[model samples]
Target: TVTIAMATVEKQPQYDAPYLVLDNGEKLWVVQHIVPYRDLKAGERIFGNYSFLEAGESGFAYNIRLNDYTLVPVQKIIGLNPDNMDSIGNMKVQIKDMWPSDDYLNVRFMLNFPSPQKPILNLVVNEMIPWTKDGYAHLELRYNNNGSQGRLVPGMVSFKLDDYSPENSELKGIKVLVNPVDGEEKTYIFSYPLTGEDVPGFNPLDLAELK
Candidate 1:
C-alpha cells in the first residue's frame, strides 16, 4: 500500500514525467500509468502491483510507477463481495460452459435472482483481461434488463461472452456491478483459476471441481 498525493502538473516541482509524492518524503517519476489522469489526486492510498524503476535517477529517491492503483480507499474496498463476502446470497453465479470459437475462446454463465426481487435499474459488466498488473479490458458494456423503466423481472439472466483475446496478458474472469432502481449498489467479482494449457492448445474443465 502506497500513499498517493495530488501531485498535479503544478504540484510536481521538477520531474519531467508525471510524478507522485510518496508518503516517505520521496519523489517518484511515473513511467507507466494506472488510474486515469483526471482521477489522480493528492492524499489517496492505494494497494496494487507496482514496478520500481532504477534507484537514484539523479533527481528523486525512488522511481516507481503506479502499475495498478485504486482510487477507492482501503476501507471502501472489499473482497469477493463489497456488501458481504460470506453472504452474497442475493445473486447466484454459475459457469454454464466454455468452448473454443472462431478466433477467441467462448465462455458462458448464468445469473439468478431470488424472489421478492429488487428492482434493478442497470447492469454494468466489465470484461477485464489482465495484462501484467494494471490494464483495461478489450470490451465493456452496459445493458438494461427491464427497458427504460427498469425493474427486476427476475428469472434467469444469461450473459453472452464477448470476444476478447488479451495479447500477452493473463485473462481474468469478470467484474459485475449491479445497480438497482432505487437502492444500494452491489459489486461482484466472478473470478476463476486459469491454470491450464496454453491458448490454441487447451485442457478440459474439471466440472466436478466447480460443483
Candidate 2:
C-alpha cells in the first residue's frame, strides 16, 4: 500500500529535473538525490543468480531497484546460465525458441529508461508471457545483491504500458542506451510482466494500440 505522485518537473543541466511526490509527503529530488537504481553497485564486476523458466510460467518477469548511490540494481537474471539455456544469448531472446508449445509466446521484457543517448540503460528479460486480453500477465522477480546496497527506487522499475510518460518532455524520444557512460558501463538483466501494455523489445512503439 504505497502511493507516488509528481509535484513539478524542474529543469536542470545535463539531466532533466523531476520532482516526485511520494505517498509519504516527501519530495524525491532527482537532481539533488539518487533515483531508484534497484540496489545495484558498481561491482568488482560479477554475475548474480539465474532464474529457470518453465512452461506455463509467467508474470512479474523481472525487476531491478535503485541503490543508495543512485545506481540501477538488478534483481535477478532470467537466462544467462548456459548449463540450462544453451546456444545464443543476444541480450534479447525471442520466446518461440524456448518452448515448443507455440501456445505460449516468447516475450522480451525490455525496460527503456528515458535517456538522451542512443544506447539507453536497458534492463532486459527474456522468456516472458504476454499480456492477457484484459491487460495482465504473469509477473516474477528475482532479487540478488552483493550485500552492499539498499532498497530499490520504486520509480526506476515502474512500467508505462498505457502511457510512457516521465513528465520530462525529452523522455518522449529517448532510446535505450546500453552503455550509458564512457569506459564505465553496466548492463543488468531482469524480467517483469505488464498486464496493461507491451514493450516491443526496447524499441519505439505506440502503446495506445494495446487497448
Candidate 3:
C-alpha cells in the first residue's frame, strides 16, 4: 500500500482542460462532470487532495488551485460539513458510472466524515475513483477547536472526480494517514475504468498478493 503525504496534496481548481491520467497506462477522459461533494473543477486537476489541518479563529476551511501552482476561486475555500450530517454508519466518497457524455464526463459521490475521530469504523470508499492527474486528492479533516489532541472541528475536504478518462500512473495501492492531526488520506499508484469492472467496491487491493 502506498501512503500519500498531507503536504503532497492540493485541491483541483476550476479549469477548461478535463483530462486525468491513471495507472496501467490507461486514461480518464473527462466528458461530463456531475455534482461533486468537493468544489473541484470538472476539467482541472488539483495538485493533490487534502482536508484541513486545524480550525482557525474564523471557522473550518480549505482551498484549491487551478493547476499544480495556481489557486482556484477564493470562494471555493469550502468547508467539510457545515452541520447536520449523518455519521452513524460507514461513510463513503464515490465517483462512478461514468461514460463519454457526447462531449463531457459525468460523475458524482457523497462525503461524510464523522466525529470522535473514528477512522476504522466511520470510513469507506463506496463508488470511489483512482487518482489521475499529478497531485493526490487532499482531504483536510478540520479540527473543531485546535485542541491539544486536535479534536475534530466538524468539517472535511477531498478531491471530487466528476468524470473523465484516465491514463497510467503506478498503482501504489491504498493507505491512510493521521500525523496530520488524526486525519486520514489514501494513496495508490493505480487506475480503473470510470464505468466498468467495479470501481471502488470491487477494486479493493489484494493485500495478500502484495505481501
Candidate 4:
C-alpha cells in the first residue's frame, strides 16, 4: 500500500541515486528507475505517495507533486505610522482553522463574497507594532467584489515565517485582523510551537514507525 502525505523538504536530491529527506525525519530514496528525478529545493512543500521498503532499507516515494505556491513573508517598513494606515474593511471572513506547519503558517478560511478570483493577502509589521514589542505579527486579507453577488468561498494559504523571524527567534505568535460583514473587526492570535491538537486534520499515527 502507498501512503499519501504532505511534508517540507529538508534536503534536496544530490549526486547519483539521490534521496530526499523530509522534515518528519523520513529518508526516501528517489527511484530513478521508475521516474525522473526532480531538482527539489529545501523548505519546499510537497505532496506525494510513498511506501516503506523491507527492513534495513529506506522508504520510496513516487508520483511526487510540487506546488507553485510561495509563502508571503511579513513586510516591515520604517517610519510607517499605524494611525495613518488604512483600516481593515468589512469583508466577511470566517477562519476555519490555522496552525503552524514546519516553517510556515497554514490558514483555512471562508470568504462571504463572490470574488471572481483569489483575494490578495499580506502580512505586515510596522515600526509602531513591531513583532519584538507584542510578539504578534499582523496579517491582512483583502478582496474586492466589484459589486458582484454570489455565495461563500473557501480559501487556504500559507505564510512564510522564516523571513520575519526564524525558528530560534523570540517571536511568540501572530495576530490576524479581520472585519466581518456582520460584526466589528476582530483579532485572532495563534501562538508558536502549536501542538498536534491545534492543527486541523492531524493524524496521531503519523508519528509511528514501521517495524
Candidate 5:
C-alpha cells in the first residue's frame, strides 16, 4: 500500500539518498530514483506517495519507494491589514474534505466563483481563543477573489500546523470558520490526526499496513 505524507528535506547525503523528516519526527529515506537528487534541496517542503521497503536500526523506515510528488506551498500568515480585509471574497466556499498528512493539513474546497486565476487563501487564527484549555485551534479561512467572476471552481490548499500547537501540548482538533456570501459564518471541526471517516480519500486499513 502507498502512504501519503508531507515532509521537509532534512538531510541530503553525499553518497546515499536524502532523508525527509515528518512533523511527528519520523525520518524516511528516499530509496527510489523517481526524482533527481539534485532537484531536491534541503529544507524544501514536499508532498508525495511512498511505500515502505525496510526499517533501519532506529526502527524507522529507511528504505522507501518514493513516487509521484509535488512541491506544496507552505501557508504563511500576514498580519491583519486593511487591504486584506477589503480583498476578502464574497464567493461561497464549501469545504469538501480535510486530512492530516504528516506535518501539513490538506483541505479541499469548492468555490462558487470559477475564476481563471487562483484565489488567495489564508488561514487567520484567532489568538484570543485559548488553545490549551479547549484543545481546539480556531481559525478563519480567508479567500481573496481578486475581482474575478465566473462559475464554480475546485481548489486544494494545505497548511502547516507545526506552530499552531505548543510544544508537548495536546491539540485535539481544529475549527475552521468560513463566511458565506448570503448567510452566517459556518463552522467545520476536524479532529486532529484525521481518520478515514474524516477524509474521503483516507483508508484506515491501508494506513495500518504502512505502519
Candidate 6:
C-alpha cells in the first residue's frame, strides 16, 4: 500500500526533500533525479516503486536502523516500463481521439475485447494531470456488449474533459482502473500526447454513452 504525507523538517533539499512515504513506513529516494514530467506538489498521493541496493559502498545504505524504528533505504523506480500489465493483453485500450471543445475537451477511448466468452469491463479515471487548483473532472467509462455477435467487439467511450489544458499537453496523463472480470482488476497509467498533430480514428456510438 502507498500513502502521501507532508515532509518533515528533518528532510533537507540537499538530502531527499522530495520522495514518497509508503504505507509500510519505508522511504523511497532517487539518486539520478531529473525534472518530473508534471508539476509535483509537496502534498499529494501518487503511484510509484523502488529497489534496495545490493553490493554498494556505504555501510548504512542497506541498513534499516534508526533507534527503535527500521526505515529501509530504496532508490529510483519510475517510468520503468509504464504500461498495461499482463492480465489485460486479451483486452486492449486505444486512445481514439481528443480535441478542444467549448468548456471542456472531448476525449475518447476505444477498447477492444477479443474474448470468445462474454466479459465484464470497467474503467475509471482516478487522476488527472496538471493537478487542478479547483477539484478534478469526474470521468468514467464502461464497456457494453449489448448482446452483439462478435468475438472482437469495438467499444467506444467519450468524456467531456476538464482540469486540463492544451497549453501543457506534455504533462497530460491519467491513472485508469480497469476490470476485465467481476473479481479481477488492473490499474494502468496512460499519457495522452496532444501536439499540433491530431489523433485520427472513430468508433460507432451505439456501443457507448455518457453517465
| Best-matching candidate per lDDT | 5
Model 3: per-residue lDDT, tens digit, 1-211? 2211112122243433433322122233333332232344443422222222332222113222211222211112122342412332222233222222111122222222344343321222222344446443322212221112322222212333222224323322222211222234433222332333422221112211111
Candidate 6 clashes: the total is 0
- lDDT, ranked from best to worst: 5, 4, 1, 6, 3, 2
- TM-score of every model? 0.26, 0.19, 0.19, 0.55, 0.68, 0.24
The most accurate candidate by TM-score is 5
Candidate 6 residue-wise lDDT at 6: 17
lDDT by residue for model 1 (144-188), tens: 222223222222121223333332245454444443334555433
Q: What is the lDDT of every predicted structure here?
A: 0.35, 0.24, 0.26, 0.47, 0.61, 0.33
Give the clashing pairs for model 5. 114-151
Model 5 earns a TM-score of: 0.68
**Could you tell which candidate, 2 or 3, scores higher by lDDT?**
3
- For candidate 6, the per-residue lDDT at 90 reads 31
Which is better, 2 or 4, measured by lDDT? 4
Compute the lDDT for candidate 1.
Answer: 0.35
| Candidate 4: worst-modelled 10 consecutive residues by lDDT | 202-211
lDDT of 4: 0.47
Distance from true location, Cα of 199 in model 2, Å: 25
Residues 1-211 of candidate 6: C-alpha lDDT, one tens digit per residue: 2121111112335543444443223454434222351234343433222234332232223221111111211111111111532221334334444343222233344433434445433333433334455332323333444343354443222232334433344445544444444345554433444342333332223212311
Residue pairs in collision within model 4: none
RMSD of each: 17.6, 19.5, 18.9, 7.6, 5.8, 18.2
TM-score attained by model 1:
0.26
